[PDB]
Design an enzyme around this catalytic site. Structure first.
Site, PDB file in Angstrom:
ATOM      1  N   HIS A  33      40.259  40.527  46.977  1.00  0.00           N
ATOM      2  CA  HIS A  33      39.711  40.464  45.633  1.00  0.00           C
ATOM      3  C   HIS A  33      39.766  41.880  45.095  1.00  0.00           C
ATOM      4  CE1 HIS A  33      38.233  36.297  45.790  1.00  0.00           C
ATOM      5  NE2 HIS A  33      38.364  36.595  47.062  1.00  0.00           N
ATOM      6  N   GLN A  66      28.571  34.928  40.076  1.00  0.00           N
ATOM      7  CA  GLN A  66      29.916  34.650  39.605  1.00  0.00           C
ATOM      8  C   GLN A  66      29.874  34.102  38.183  1.00  0.00           C
ATOM      9  OE1 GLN A  66      32.146  32.072  42.168  1.00  0.00           O
ATOM     10  NE2 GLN A  66      33.847  31.718  40.826  1.00  0.00           N
ATOM     11  N   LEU A 116      35.883  40.567  51.826  1.00  0.00           N
ATOM     12  CA  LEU A 116      36.690  40.244  50.651  1.00  0.00           C
ATOM     13  C   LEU A 116      37.653  41.365  50.357  1.00  0.00           C
ATOM     14  CD1 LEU A 116      33.799  38.674  48.427  1.00  0.00           C
ATOM     15  CD2 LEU A 116      35.399  37.527  49.908  1.00  0.00           C
ATOM     16  N   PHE A 147      24.308  37.506  48.127  1.00  0.00           N
ATOM     17  CA  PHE A 147      25.748  37.600  48.103  1.00  0.00           C
ATOM     18  C   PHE A 147      26.248  38.105  46.749  1.00  0.00           C
ATOM     19  CE2 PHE A 147      29.838  34.786  48.144  1.00  0.00           C
ATOM     20  CZ  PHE A 147      30.631  35.908  48.386  1.00  0.00           C
ATOM     21  N   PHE A 173      32.844  38.423  39.821  1.00  0.00           N
ATOM     22  CA  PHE A 173      31.534  38.328  40.438  1.00  0.00           C
ATOM     23  C   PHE A 173      30.948  39.734  40.580  1.00  0.00           C
ATOM     24  CE2 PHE A 173      32.779  39.544  44.845  1.00  0.00           C
ATOM     25  CZ  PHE A 173      34.156  39.416  44.757  1.00  0.00           C
ATOM     26  N   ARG A 190      27.612  30.217  39.270  1.00  0.00           N
ATOM     27  CA  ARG A 190      27.409  30.182  40.709  1.00  0.00           C
ATOM     28  C   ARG A 190      26.704  31.475  41.092  1.00  0.00           C
ATOM     29  NH1 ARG A 190      31.244  31.621  45.167  1.00  0.00           N
ATOM     30  NH2 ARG A 190      30.725  30.386  47.007  1.00  0.00           N
ATOM     31  N   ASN A 225      39.207  34.580  42.438  1.00  0.00           N
ATOM     32  CA  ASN A 225      40.585  34.101  42.303  1.00  0.00           C
ATOM     33  C   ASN A 225      40.807  32.834  43.065  1.00  0.00           C
ATOM     34  OD1 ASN A 225      41.611  36.941  44.392  1.00  0.00           O
ATOM     35  ND2 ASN A 225      41.362  34.876  45.156  1.00  0.00           N
TER      36      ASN A 225
END
Lengths: 11, 165
Positions: free
Chosen positions: B126, B63, B122, B60, B113, B55, B102
């Site tokens: 995370h 991942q 986040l 951004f 990521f 991904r 997660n």
């Protein structure tokens, strides 16, 4: 949206 | 004590792109850093070598880390399937941050990521545990194969990985 999940990816 | 440095060699449909190396903050998050270090060497009998970035969303993050299912549903830590959120001392302050993916509080496995932007939403959710030390330009070239929904146009894999220091 912008999340980083493992399994159910949300918006 | 020195923080470990690990590396990934990235390939794009089997074509080698280049090496990205990461500093892992074992001094702030020893257990999360250890997990990622041991998965990068493959010393427990499983790890990131040969797995893919499933991904990538431009602007951004990228991942990866799902070496069992290769799709966001698998991977496991060196501690068993999942482990706790160690702490959230560090924040997602800019491009280059390494953080754990997660599925909710205390569900850390192997998926991680690499942020290509500051993602302060986040923070506290995370666990940040490392940062790109060299090869940010390979992360930028990786980002070119992502899309708004996360699917990549080319297969991006970790062709090799290991610890440098």
């Amino acid at each position: 949206x912008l999340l980083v999940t493992a399994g159910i990816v949300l918006a | 004590m020195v923080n470990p440095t690990v590396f990934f060699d990235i390939a794009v449909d089997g074509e080698p792109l280049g090496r990205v190396s990461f500093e892992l903050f074992a001094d702030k998050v020893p257990k999360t850093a250890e997990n990622f270090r041991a998965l990068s060497t493959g010393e427990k009998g499983f790890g990131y070598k040969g797995s893919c970035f499933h991904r990538i969303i431009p602007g951004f993050m990228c991942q990866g880390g799902d070496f069992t299912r290769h799709n966001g549903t698998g991977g496991k830590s060196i501690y068993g399937e999942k482990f706790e959120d160690e702490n959230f001392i560090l924040k997602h302050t800019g491009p280059g941050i390494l953080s754990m993916a997660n599925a909710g509080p205390n569900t850390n496995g192997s998926q991680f990521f690499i942020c290509t932007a500051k993602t302060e939403w986040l923070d506290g959710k995370h666990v940040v545990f490392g940062k790109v030390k060299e090869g940010m330009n390979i992360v930028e070239a990786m980002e070119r194969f992502g899309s708004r929904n996360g699917k990549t146009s080319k297969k991006i894999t970790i062709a090799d990985c290991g610890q440098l220091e």
